Design a protein around this ligand. Sequence first.
Ligand SMILES: CCCCCCCCCCCCCCCCCC(=O)OC[C@H](COP(=O)(O)OCCN)OC(=O)CCCCCCCCCCCCCCCCC
Ligand SMILES: CCCCCCCCCCCCCCCCCC(=O)OC[C@H](COP(=O)(O)OCCN)OC(=O)CCCCCCCCCCCCCCCCC
Ligand SMILES: *[C@H]1CC(=O)N(CC/N=C2/CN3CCN4CCN(CCN(CC3)CC(=O)OO2)CC(=O)OOC(=O)C4)C1=O
Ligand SMILES: *[C@H]1CC(=O)N(CC/N=C2/CN3CCN4CCN(CCN(CC3)CC(=O)OO2)CC(=O)OOC(=O)C4)C1=O
Ligand SMILES: CCCCCCCCCCCCO[C@@H]1O[C@H](CO)[C@@H](O[C@H]2O[C@H](CO)[C@@H](O)[C@H](O)[C@H]2O)[C@H](O)[C@H]1O
Ligand SMILES: CCCCCCCCCCCCO[C@@H]1O[C@H](CO)[C@@H](O[C@H]2O[C@H](CO)[C@@H](O)[C@H](O)[C@H]2O)[C@H](O)[C@H]1O
Ligand SMILES: Nc1ncnc2c1ncn2[C@@H]1O[C@H](COP(=O)(O)OP(=O)(O)NP(=O)(O)O)[C@@H](O)[C@H]1O
Ligand SMILES: Nc1ncnc2c1ncn2[C@@H]1O[C@H](COP(=O)(O)OP(=O)(O)NP(=O)(O)O)[C@@H](O)[C@H]1O
Ligand SMILES: [Gd]
Ligand SMILES: [Gd]
Ligand SMILES: [Mg+2]
Ligand SMILES: [Mg+2]
Lengths: 113, 113, 577, 577
Amino acid sequence: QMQLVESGGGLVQAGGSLRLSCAVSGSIFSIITLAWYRQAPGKPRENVATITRGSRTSYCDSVKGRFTISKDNAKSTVYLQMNKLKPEDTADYYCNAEGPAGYWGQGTPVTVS
Amino acid sequence: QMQLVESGGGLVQAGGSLRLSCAVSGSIFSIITLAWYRQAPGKPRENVATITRGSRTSYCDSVKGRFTISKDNAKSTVYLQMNKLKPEDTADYYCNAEGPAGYWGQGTPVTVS
Amino acid sequence: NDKDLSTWQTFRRLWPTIAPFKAGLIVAGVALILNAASDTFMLSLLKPLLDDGFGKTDRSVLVWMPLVVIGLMILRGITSYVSSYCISWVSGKVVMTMRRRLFGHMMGMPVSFFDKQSTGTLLSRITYDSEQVASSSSGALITVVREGASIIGLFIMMFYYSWQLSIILIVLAPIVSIAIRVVSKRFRNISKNMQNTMGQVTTSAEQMLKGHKEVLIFGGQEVETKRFDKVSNRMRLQGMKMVSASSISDPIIQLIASLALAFVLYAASFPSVMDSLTAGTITVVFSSMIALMRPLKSLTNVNAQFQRGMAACQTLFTILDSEQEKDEGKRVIERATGDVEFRNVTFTYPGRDVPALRNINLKIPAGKTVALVGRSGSGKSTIASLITRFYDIDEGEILMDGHDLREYTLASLRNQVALVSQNVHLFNDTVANNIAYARTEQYSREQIEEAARMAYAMDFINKMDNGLDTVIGENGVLLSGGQRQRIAIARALLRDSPILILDEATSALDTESERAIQAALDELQKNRTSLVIAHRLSTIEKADEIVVVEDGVIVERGTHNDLLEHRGVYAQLHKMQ
Amino acid sequence: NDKDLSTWQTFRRLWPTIAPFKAGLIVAGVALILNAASDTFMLSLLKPLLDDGFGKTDRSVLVWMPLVVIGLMILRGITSYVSSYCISWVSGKVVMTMRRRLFGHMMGMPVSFFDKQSTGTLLSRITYDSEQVASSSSGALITVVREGASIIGLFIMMFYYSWQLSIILIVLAPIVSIAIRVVSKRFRNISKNMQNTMGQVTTSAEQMLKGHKEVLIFGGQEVETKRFDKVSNRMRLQGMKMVSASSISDPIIQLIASLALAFVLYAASFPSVMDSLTAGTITVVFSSMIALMRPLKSLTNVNAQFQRGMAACQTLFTILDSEQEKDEGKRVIERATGDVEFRNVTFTYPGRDVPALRNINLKIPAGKTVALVGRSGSGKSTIASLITRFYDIDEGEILMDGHDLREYTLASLRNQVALVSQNVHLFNDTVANNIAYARTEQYSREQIEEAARMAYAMDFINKMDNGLDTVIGENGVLLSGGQRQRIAIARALLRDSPILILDEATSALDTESERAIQAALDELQKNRTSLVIAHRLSTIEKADEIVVVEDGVIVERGTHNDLLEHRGVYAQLHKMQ
Ligand SMILES: CCCCCCCCCCCCCCCCCC(=O)OC[C@H](COP(=O)(O)OCCN)OC(=O)CCCCCCCCCCCCCCCCC
Ligand SMILES: CCCCCCCCCCCCCCCCCC(=O)OC[C@H](COP(=O)(O)OCCN)OC(=O)CCCCCCCCCCCCCCCCC
Ligand SMILES: *[C@H]1CC(=O)N(CC/N=C2/CN3CCN4CCN(CCN(CC3)CC(=O)OO2)CC(=O)OOC(=O)C4)C1=O
Ligand SMILES: *[C@H]1CC(=O)N(CC/N=C2/CN3CCN4CCN(CCN(CC3)CC(=O)OO2)CC(=O)OOC(=O)C4)C1=O
Ligand SMILES: CCCCCCCCCCCCO[C@@H]1O[C@H](CO)[C@@H](O[C@H]2O[C@H](CO)[C@@H](O)[C@H](O)[C@H]2O)[C@H](O)[C@H]1O
Ligand SMILES: CCCCCCCCCCCCO[C@@H]1O[C@H](CO)[C@@H](O[C@H]2O[C@H](CO)[C@@H](O)[C@H](O)[C@H]2O)[C@H](O)[C@H]1O
Ligand SMILES: Nc1ncnc2c1ncn2[C@@H]1O[C@H](COP(=O)(O)OP(=O)(O)NP(=O)(O)O)[C@@H](O)[C@H]1O
Ligand SMILES: Nc1ncnc2c1ncn2[C@@H]1O[C@H](COP(=O)(O)OP(=O)(O)NP(=O)(O)O)[C@@H](O)[C@H]1O
Ligand SMILES: [Gd]
Ligand SMILES: [Gd]
Ligand SMILES: [Mg+2]
Ligand SMILES: [Mg+2]
């Protein structure tokens, strides 16, 4: 059974930089779709970034140009890169494998001063 | 060879009523598409009304609600009905059978005071 | 249809086929005469052996008699071998020629013929009927000529020693002849019924085999088994009719020719016939009237066998003098200049009494694309099939380069058209052979690779474990549906025919694959006549003339933007897609 | 594969089949004994006729001799008829049983078997091979038993009058026997090669007939004609090999048995053998040698014929003891409760060494719809074919209602699935029969009309000149492509199966037709399990789970709106469509 675990950051100040990682095991990592979702305490899960086999990337307009999504096949690890963080980004971030109806990780909280 | 001849009106005052007819012979009149086009001295031909086998009608927005298009299968005659004419309608009106790449008639001029 | 003629009539009909092979027949006739002579002389040796007794007369003859027997056996073996080999050779050549003629005739039939036929019936004509001809003309024919020659020899030997008894043989011969007449007609009728039943058996097995998946998922095993039981029992019953006629005719004919044995015994008992000759002469006669009853049994049984092939030959002739694709056009066009014009054509399918197209005035100029759109069953594939002369129009004219299609040679006409049909059919060979199906020597492997790359098939071919040399299934079954479609597209693109017809050639493909194929088509067919039949409008947006068809009439025609104006049928299709 | 066994060995294998029909065989054996007795007694009548001379002895035998002859002929005819009829009857029953068994065996084979086979080869097994069995066991078998019985009678009559000459007959019999041994093996080998060549001939004719349109438009007549010439000439050459062996073996065996005639003449010439018996026995003896040489010729020629059927029987046995669809599940399900689950299944097609699906963890809950999307060649029809157990998975488990698919009876499993395949196959029958293909007695015509109306096929059926009773072509050829698709849709909808699979079931249809069909599917399949394979996203927008497949792996799954978020593969497909 394929399982995927997040290694995230903690509390960062406004305008700082962060990087989250997610290791996916039991997967055909070179083909499946990977994504980063976020969840505020009130609002439901919202897709933040998506990466696909051809390394094609996508992002929610409200965060395009700030975050980056990358994946290393050899390490089989997906990465989310944070730049110019804002207080509205303080939420629980999850990684996802192959679609919103697929597989999710534990998730890591991120707080912005 | 199918041929289609127009019987139109002449000069009418503003706000008047007119009715043009077109007889189509040599056609499968119950199925083919029929249309009324118009041409000003400067502008090219512009579709005014269209009627199709299921008696479904269509009209250019700038004239919808004023003209009507009808067809009598037994007489095999298509009809255009004019109501609340405007000076901008003064042009040469043609009937058309089965598409802009199909068959056209001689056409009849219509002038509005 | 086949009227029962006779044995002599069917051999007269077959003679033009057997004529090239006269020499083997002549040598086999000589061998048959020598073989019959050897047989008769051996059965005649009795009279010296009996009259010139073992001890009654000087032994003299007894000394050289064994060597005469062994030498006559030597000669008999040689002549029998030569006769059998030559007759079998001629029969095999005749059967191969008839098989090739039947194959060519079937390959030349019209499309409506195959629409109203079953594959199993024609395949039965190829397999069962011709193998009946072969079995008859090889085995039964040797048997009948050899036993006839034996009978004639015994007749000759008997008319010599005592004609007074050969006279009763003479009077009984016509009775046996007319009996064999009647039974032969019965045999031929039964054989024709058997041919038809075997066609039904083949049709049943064919339909089961080619619909195996539907049988499996809809649980059709009971129905198919019951059907096959019906046809196979009917085959058994007709074989039983044949056996009934055979085993009722053989004993009666042996009963008739036995009256000769009864008559010779009565003549011997009569007090005025004997003492003319030695005991040996009537001994030879009784031995030879007896001997004579044996080739009669052989002849009648192999006649049962032989009429099967006679009937199959008669069926063959009836098929071979049928009409083929109507081909009475002589001009041979080297390469058409694109233009195709329907002028006022009306078409009705055979035996359907309602037109499929009514008044089609459609122009396909050289270098241009016409896109046929319309709902299912409106008549687009019908127009496509009329361009290729699969069917012939009832009224109007279809012109190519200013001339009627029927004015052209069929082969010359069809060399101008490359067609991807709605229903893709592939052959059980390799990918390269499928792409260059009928032109494996004319197209280089580089040209085949370019064709497969224009059809977006080069990617999945390189993922096959054998490359372009991978064997695909019977109908490309070892491929996905879109892969089969793309292979057929490549097959049509390999031949830069002036007229290219695509008949929903993107139906099994995904949007990106169709976009790639459309990009390849753009440049390749910028100066080539093209006719595209599409149910999706994204495929045909750039076509020079879009034509909308409904119930077999053109209802609109025009370009994409002019048709998106004019707010007619095409506007509704585009809006709802 | 078939190792040449022997004639006796194939008869032992045939006995389980001939055992139900023992009574006819017993009566035919009695009839054969009586027939041989009549033959031998008739050929024995010489010795009274010669010893009790025409005038040398008192005329007391010749008066009643004609009536004896006619009565013995009467009896001979009756016994010959009975023997022939019963043996032919038993052979026909055996052949029909073998034909039915071969049909059932082919109907039970796996799908991969038909993928790697040719239809013409199997059809040849049904037609040519079984007709060889029939021809042999009917004609040649009667001939061989009757001539054997005749030979045994002549042997008996000869050992009686003068054993001193029967001794040389005894010593020559084994030589003739071992000769017939060797030639029979050669005949069987040639016959098997001929069977294979006939399969090739049928394959060629089949491929021509079913690809007739491609032959016509791509100009394949030369290639097909050349192919057929090759196979037909090979068939002729193998028939020539058979004839060579036949016409070389027959004269040699007749040369051997003639040494008996040479020996009897030498014994007669020898000065110590005669005077034991007067003119009479030795005349009967010479006449019996000359008679005995005749059934030998008949026996050898019909042995040439008979080994064909022996070889065909051996091939039949080899086919009949092959393995069939693996069916070792015994938990029949009356009606499945919808759920279908794939657990880490991996599938590789036979002889392809690269997986088509890799780790499929896919759930199809009861009452829900899963829509499989993805590019061509990604593996959607493979998943569909794994659900129906057309192929068996290599790793993982496919579960239905909590149980593995292989745990179930195949027929029970397939009664749960209604499938419209990517490649639509129809049967040459009426529209109603096609819709209710294997259930013509279970479904009312009202139910058939409701099915055809749910499939939007009711409109064009009412425009046919015969209604639902119109006969469609061999593969529905007398219909348009969308009409054939809609008929197959109606066929699948007639059976309210708990699991319905549509495999691009809107490919040949126009947008409005698909919308109508989709509306009908809405209400009918709101609580059925459904699996839809689509290349068009407008068809599958309401599906409960959309699953995107690529190269055999699930790359995304989710609902339409959740997948239009998440901006992944499905978002790109939707944007570009
Ligand atoms: C003196 C000079 C005479 C010259 C005559 C010259 C012409 C001779 C006659 C013509 C030649 C023979 C014609 C052979 C073909 C006739 C058709 C045939 O065989 O039909 C048999 C018939 C078949 O069955 P049926 O129901 O009719 O059809 C469907 C099922 N097959 O089955 C039947 O209904 C038949 C009855 C069943 C049993 C038949 C066998 C009985 C035994 C026959 C033994 C014969 C030996 C000699 C006996 C002599 C006794 C005095
Ligand atoms: C007295 C002996 C007692 C002791 C021994 C007892 C046991 C005897 C066993 C006999 C076995 C017989 C076997 C017969 C079948 C053998 C196979 C066969 O017939 O092959 C013939 C062969 C086929 O052609 P081939 O070129 O080899 O291959 C290409 C495809 N045909 O063709 C050839 O290559 C050879 C062709 C030869 C020429 C044809 C025949 C010419 C005439 C001779 C036949 C008539 C003889 C009659 C008697 C008179 C004396 C010779
Ligand atoms: C992506 C980036 C982000 O933060 N998003 C949320 C922005 N706020 C939205 C309010 N939305 C509430 C109702 N949504 C359900 C319908 N959504 C479409 C209508 N949305 C306006 C009302 C437009 C949005 O896409 O986002 O909306 C569809 C949806 O699932 O989006 O999420 C949502 O908030 C619930 C982002 O969408
Ligand atoms: C229907 C009713 C009527 O009277 N029309 C003309 C209205 N005037 C239009 C100006 N148009 C000039 C260039 N057109 C070529 C492109 N057209 C699309 C852009 N049009 C704006 C510029 C928008 C219109 O549909 O109509 O435009 C496409 C076209 O063929 O329309 O005709 C046209 O005038 C030329 C009507 O269109
Ligand atoms: C089916 C297996 C093939 C092997 C067959 C072995 C049996 C062959 C017997 C041939 C039958 C008799 O063949 C007979 O030949 C003569 C000429 O010789 C044909 O005669 C034909 O040609 C002559 C000469 O041009 C013309 O009069 C006319 O065209 C026609 O009668 C007879 O119509 C045919 O009946
Ligand atoms: C070619 C088509 C066939 C239709 C025509 C039939 C022709 C007649 C063939 C005669 C066959 C002789 O059949 C002979 O029967 C005996 C009966 O004990 C079989 O003997 C059998 O006995 C035992 C039980 O009794 C079986 O387990 C076993 O299969 C076999 O040994 C012989 O193996 C077979 O050789
Ligand atoms: N061989 C045939 N014999 C008789 N009628 C036929 C035959 N083929 C097609 N038809 C009918 O002729 C009409 C037009 O057929 P066809 O030209 O194949 O439609 P189409 O436009 O190709 N449909 P589609 O492929 O679904 O887009 C329909 O009513 C068909 O049922
Ligand atoms: N019988 C077969 N034997 C071997 N390989 C096969 C067979 N059928 C399909 N394949 C291959 O298996 C892969 C998946 O096939 P398939 O599942 O049919 O694709 P698909 O998703 O149905 N394509 P499409 O029909 O165009 O949407 C492709 O590489 C096929 O060529
Ligand atoms: Gd939203
Ligand atoms: Gd405009
Ligand atoms: Mg079509
Ligand atoms: Mg598929």
